[PDB]
């Protein structure tokens, strides 16, 4: 939740807060087998809006 400002800027507090300590969105790369699907499946579906 509570982090610091690495570069001290004049007139700005050096203590920032994350909003809910929520950092969402991290993940890893793909292998050759996780990629067959997501390929051999983007070939069966046609997007639609």
């Amino acid at each position: 939740t509570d982090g610091t400002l690495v570069t001290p800027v004049p007139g700005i507090s050096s203590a920032v807060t994350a909003y809910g300590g929520n950092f969402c969105g991290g993940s890893d790369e793909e292998e050759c087998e996780q990629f067959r699907t997501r390929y051999l499946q983007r070939l069966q579906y046609q997007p639609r809006f």
């Binding site: 509570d2 001290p8 700005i12 507090s13 050096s14 203590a15």
Partner: protein, 77 residues
Amino acid sequence: TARTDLPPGPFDPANWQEISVEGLVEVVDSATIDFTGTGAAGDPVSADVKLDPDPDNLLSATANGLILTADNIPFPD
């Protein structure tokens, strides 16, 4: 006094709160305003508008300020 748990760095007024001490001023009651107190803790500077204590002074002062309502006025009769 540091306002927050702050990392090393140069002094910045946005991170430090200045510690004052106290303050004593001089006040004199005016012709229409009464002053009380000296500004110290527990003895703060306060003011209140003083009205004429003339018996027929319809003007009065409740706990919310001056009042002159139409009820107590000797309307024509």
